[PDB]
Ligand binder design. Sequence first.
Ligand code: NAI
Ligand code: NAI
Ligand code: NAI
Ligand code: NAI
Lengths: 267, 267, 267, 267
Amino acid sequence: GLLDGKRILVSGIITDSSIAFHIARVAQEQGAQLVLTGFDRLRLIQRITDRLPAKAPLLELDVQNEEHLASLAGRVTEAIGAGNKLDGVVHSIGFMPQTGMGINPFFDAPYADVSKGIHISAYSYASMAKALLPIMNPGGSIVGMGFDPSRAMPAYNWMTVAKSALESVNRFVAREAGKYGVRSNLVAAGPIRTLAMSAIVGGALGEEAGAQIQLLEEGWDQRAPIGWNMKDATPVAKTVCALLSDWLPATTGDIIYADGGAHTQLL
Amino acid sequence: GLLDGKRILVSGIITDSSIAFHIARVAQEQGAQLVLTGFDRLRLIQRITDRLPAKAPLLELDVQNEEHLASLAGRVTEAIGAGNKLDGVVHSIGFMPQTGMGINPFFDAPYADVSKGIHISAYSYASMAKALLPIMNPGGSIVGMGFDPSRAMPAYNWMTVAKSALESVNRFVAREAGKYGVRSNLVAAGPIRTLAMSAIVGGALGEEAGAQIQLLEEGWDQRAPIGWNMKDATPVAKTVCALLSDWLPATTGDIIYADGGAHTQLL
Amino acid sequence: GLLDGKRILVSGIITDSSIAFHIARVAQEQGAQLVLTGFDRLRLIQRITDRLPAKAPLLELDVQNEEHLASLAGRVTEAIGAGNKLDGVVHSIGFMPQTGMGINPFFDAPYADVSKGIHISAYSYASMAKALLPIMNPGGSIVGMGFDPSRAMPAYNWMTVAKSALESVNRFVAREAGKYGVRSNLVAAGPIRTLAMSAIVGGALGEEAGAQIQLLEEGWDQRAPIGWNMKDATPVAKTVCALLSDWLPATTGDIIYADGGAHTQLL
Amino acid sequence: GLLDGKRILVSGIITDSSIAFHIARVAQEQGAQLVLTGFDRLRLIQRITDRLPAKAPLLELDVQNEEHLASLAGRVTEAIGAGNKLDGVVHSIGFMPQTGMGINPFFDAPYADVSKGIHISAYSYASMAKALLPIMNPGGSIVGMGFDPSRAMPAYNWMTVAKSALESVNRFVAREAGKYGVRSNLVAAGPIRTLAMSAIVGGALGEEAGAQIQLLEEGWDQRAPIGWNMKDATPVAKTVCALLSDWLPATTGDIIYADGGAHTQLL
Ligand SMILES: NC(=O)C1=CN([C@@H]2O[C@H](COP(=O)(O)OP(=O)(O)OC[C@H]3O[C@@H](n4cnc5c(N)ncnc54)[C@H](O)[C@@H]3O)[C@@H](O)[C@H]2O)C=CC1
Ligand SMILES: NC(=O)C1=CN([C@@H]2O[C@H](COP(=O)(O)OP(=O)(O)OC[C@H]3O[C@@H](n4cnc5c(N)ncnc54)[C@H](O)[C@@H]3O)[C@@H](O)[C@H]2O)C=CC1
Ligand SMILES: NC(=O)C1=CN([C@@H]2O[C@H](COP(=O)(O)OP(=O)(O)OC[C@H]3O[C@@H](n4cnc5c(N)ncnc54)[C@H](O)[C@@H]3O)[C@@H](O)[C@H]2O)C=CC1
Ligand SMILES: NC(=O)C1=CN([C@@H]2O[C@H](COP(=O)(O)OP(=O)(O)OC[C@H]3O[C@@H](n4cnc5c(N)ncnc54)[C@H](O)[C@@H]3O)[C@@H](O)[C@H]2O)C=CC1
């Protein structure tokens, strides 16, 4: 069991096709005891998570809520029992109001909307770390979910800016986390057919967005020297588990690309 | 005259040691007619700018003000006369509340403070572009001021996150600006002894910040194969002018490092 | 056992402080059956490898020898028995004549000497892949050893050029290897006290080299948010094993930094 | 005149569609006195260069010839007159035997052929610098021609490896050149329809190469936010001249992308 004995907080389960859902599953299959957090439809999330191969306490956490962040460590040690600490934290949380993604022209997202997306998608990586490093073991691992934002791309727009900010935050959380003996890294994932992703290629945010995203994903699989299957989140899940394991013990402030190799190839 | 005939909006003059101040000066020495914008002490800025080798209208612009952004193009064509357009825009604007720079631990900047810095230092690059591309000529150039945020560094903290977001914004403004025949680029500058920079090495934001920044700059000059003189902004000024010229006509969404070569060298 | 059942060719064992030595050891501790290759002192290597926690056939391979490359696949399937294939190949081979490292000024390495180092240290990664992909399983993994060559550094000189070429070769072997269902990646390691490394800080290649390398390594541990211990190769060993495992199944043409996080940090 | 008064050695003119040809032309139009070097058809090159807007001495230089390198500085000061030095050197030289480009599979280039291409296309950048820095002024500029080798691409194959090595060499020549007050940089150009380029899209090196290159170039113009015209070398020429000028005085060991902005954009 890659993750035998480890206690791991996995955030961001919203449906059974969330990337966190699969991380959660592969983690349990691998020996880990989890605690889960969820955003706003908690009953829905409870019903979804009932399907993991094992039970796991579930706590509410709205990353924009000071008080939830304040109480989080208490709620976690309670759920895992006093005298116990986390070995692993997964941040798999993201959001950008739709005015910052694809419908709208890039220049028409208003600041209050982008600030919200940066808050939830980038800054919150620091918040979770701050809230949780006090309850983590030496040898621990924080892992966040990004996508390669180093070139601009159609439709993703401000969400790419948010991911750029996230990569930079991650390099700073690594500085803090290191004082605890704790690694911090991002997994840069290829596009994965989430419920929201599907809704977008179905045109949820306008037709030209839809067509652009669709063209983006097909290009991925073509460049990926080992292919990319957007229908299958589990190679990303496995990658996160590798970073939660003790098998990358000298990597931090870093980015692991689970993307089929697509970013290393031009045509 | 590198810039003969060009009309250029240069933002961000606050003292005679602002980097915009020198860009302004080198630009005039080079043939350009400028319009200047300033933030909040306009009388102060007027008195400062009186010293440039030529007169230049001065307009108020608070990058967080919708109405200033709204009116900006009107105020500019008025100042340069109807039927005239800009060839050049300089964004040399930045700010991060001090809770996000160095005193404070990284995890204690509150979101409202970082959001403010991201607003002024990153998002505003899109705002200026949006406000001004309607009044720019084919062959034009937007240039913003950054610093290399690809590795974390002590004290700069959230300001580095903000610069990471800026680089990503710049790649998107390039997409928009290209429809107008207009380039967008950043100059990544080495550390330069601005009034605020000095105040910080003098300990304005705590002693350990001060010492860290001071150590940062000395490392710069040591790595720079051609040296780096933080007392002298004019090699950065000249670099911005090169991007305003027609001599980099195939570069955009890009980053030019005016940093003595320091980023290309490890020890 | 991370590597249970896998058959793995590990090249480059020359002493018990070679990085391959530890990869070999951690791999065996982890379930793998190995075949080993060695360069020129085969009796010496046999005596060294006798110390691994398990036996492993040992084959001669001089990466500059056409005939050794020609025969290699035969010799390997013989050693592992017909009808069996490799799951894993480790390239941990490197060399640059000393005229290209540190004594000599950079401009005085003669081409014939640099060509030799590029041959052994970069091109040979393609050669091993070519010689061995015919005997590898879907799901396999080729892993080479590099160091981050993206900034120039004192003394390493042409060896850095060679590592730059290696990273680029690796992106091409990924293209080929993918047709076999096989990943190709590099581990970028922090400096590790090998016999040759020690000899150099002891001044083997001149005093100023020695002092520069020594300054390089101390800077590493200072930047590394989780520290770097050049005396201990085993975090690199573990990283290579992670890439040999099935836990990074969507990464290829890529670079994993086992370097304590040092490359993500400026000061 | 951007380059008024400067003396500049421009290498690599072979036809009137060579990139050096246009650099040469734009440089003269801009005030510079040139000395030119040529590889092996000197009479041909003389007849070609007769067309520049001004005369320029022409010297033979085969970058693989020790004796030509040995004598080069003598021949140059002779041609420019004793007591005079160079302000500018252009390296616009490249070659990879066709076994390393596109016909052949990547694994079938033999080392002796790749070594040749690395010799001419990468190592020679150090050679020219070594041969010429002794006859350069403070404030001088060495400029080489590359293409972005950071992702693998079809057909270019070993020539991409060679360009990877070149970028790394350039970071080392910057270290040496800095002791003379001299900058070293590369221009990364978009694809440009040279005679050899045309021959290749015409299938000179096999049909699938041809089709791949052709697909590569069309993708360039599509990503380039300001377009890319492979028929027109003069935006690259202008970029090189910008680096020869005094307008990028703090950039070295660096890479300027004259590529329409294509590398900053994913789809
Ligand atoms: N699906 C894709 O193609 C890729 C997604 N990613 C990233 O993976 C992560 C997970 O998203 P997916 O699983 O793809 O979609 P998802 O929609 O299943 O996950 C988004 C999670 O963010 C949570 N969330 C939103 N606002 C929140 C708040 N205020 N507090 C707490 N949680 C909040 C949602 O509840 C949801 O569980 C995101 O960072 C996404 O950007 C990275 C690469 C690719
Ligand atoms: N000084 C340094 O070592 C380096 C500075 N930079 C960047 O150069 C740019 C200029 O800063 P410096 O000249 O160094 O300092 P400075 O303090 O002279 O310039 C800052 C400018 O931002 C303006 N500003 C702040 N808030 C504003 C708002 N709401 N609206 C409009 N303007 C506002 C200020 O009025 C000031 O003119 C900034 O982007 C800075 O981050 C980049 C590299 C190095
Ligand atoms: N030690 C260090 O600080 C770092 C080393 N690396 C790389 O790790 C790899 C292994 O080197 P170390 O274990 O450090 O030193 P080492 O000297 O123990 O390993 C070098 C291996 O290359 C082999 N070799 C040399 N010429 C050969 C040829 N013609 N054919 C076959 N093999 C040949 C040697 O026999 C030796 O086994 C090299 O790629 C090195 O550049 C990467 C990062 C750091
Ligand atoms: N054409 C393209 O799409 C791009 C070309 N480049 C680079 O621009 C540079 C110039 O090539 P182009 O003008 O495109 O082609 P070209 O064929 O006109 O120039 C090649 C030059 O290399 C010279 N050369 C070859 N072997 C030599 C030797 N032993 N000694 C001295 N010179 C030798 C040739 O004589 C020729 O003048 C090369 O570095 C090329 O890789 C960079 C980006 C794009």
